[PDB]
Amino acid sequence: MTEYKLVVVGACGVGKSALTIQLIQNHFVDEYDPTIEDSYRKQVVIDGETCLLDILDTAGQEEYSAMRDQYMRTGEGFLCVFAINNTKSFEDIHHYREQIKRVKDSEDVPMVLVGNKCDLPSRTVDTKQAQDLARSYGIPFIETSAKTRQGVDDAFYTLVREIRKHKEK
Ligand SMILES: Nc1nc2c(ncn2[C@@H]2O[C@H](COP(=O)(O)OP(=O)(O)O)[C@@H](O)[C@H]2O)c(=O)[nH]1
Numbered sequence: 197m198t199e200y201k202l203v204v205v206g207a208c209g210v211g212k213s214a215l216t217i218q219l220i221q222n223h224f225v226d227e228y229d230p231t232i233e234d235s236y237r238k239q240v241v242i243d244g245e246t247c248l249l250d251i252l253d254t255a256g257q258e259e260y261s262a263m264r265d266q267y268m269r270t271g272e273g274f275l276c277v278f279a280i281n282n283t284k285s286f287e288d289i290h291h292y293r294e295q296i297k298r299v300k301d302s303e304d305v306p307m308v309l310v311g312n313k314c315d316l317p318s319r320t321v322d323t324k325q326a327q328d329l330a331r332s333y334g335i336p337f338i339e340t341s342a343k344t345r346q347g348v349d350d351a352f353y354t355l356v357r358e359i360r361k362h363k364e365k
């Protein structure tokens with residue numbers, strides 16, 4: 197069956213693990229070690245296609261930089277996550293965008309921008325600012341809450357749709 201290799205990236209504490217576990221196991225985890233990097237696999241149906249998602253929940257630095265380059269080269273699409281109450285995590289998106297393009301040596305890499313924690317009242321990044329960034333990249337932007345599940349399926353399924361558009365060229 198068709199397999200999609202997805203990679204979830206972003207600053208520590210933005211909800212990469214909480215998003216991934218909500219997608220896979222349909223519950224919200226309040227505490228999950230920030231240093232754990234692991235992969236998950238789930239069979240889903242997206243637009244009538246039965247497919248397997250192979251999702252890498254990243255944790256930042258690797259023992260050797262070759263491990264980072266390896267997962268960036270093999271990953272087919274990237275979910276770039278910031279938290280709407282953490283401006284530094286939004287600014288870090290620039291770094292992930294650049295680094296992924298640099299390792300893949302491609303200007304066209306399937307990506308979706310995710311503003312997570314949208315259930316919280318505290319917000320430092322308004323929606324307009326994130327829409328402006330996504331527009332400059334030419335990629336979709338989705339606001340999510342790993343806690344309420346709002347937007348979670350849309351974020352991952354949209355990324356699959358971006359991969360499919362990239363492959364048909
Ligand atoms: N309120 C709220 N908290 C969240 C959300 N996503 C993650 N968290 C919390 O934010 C903290 C960091 O989340 P985590 O998934 O470990 O972030 P990671 O370092 O990016 O993997 C944890 O305490 C989670 O419970 C969300 O959508 N809403």
Ligand SMILES: [Mg+2]
Nearest residue numbers: 212213229230
């Ligand atoms: Mg984590």
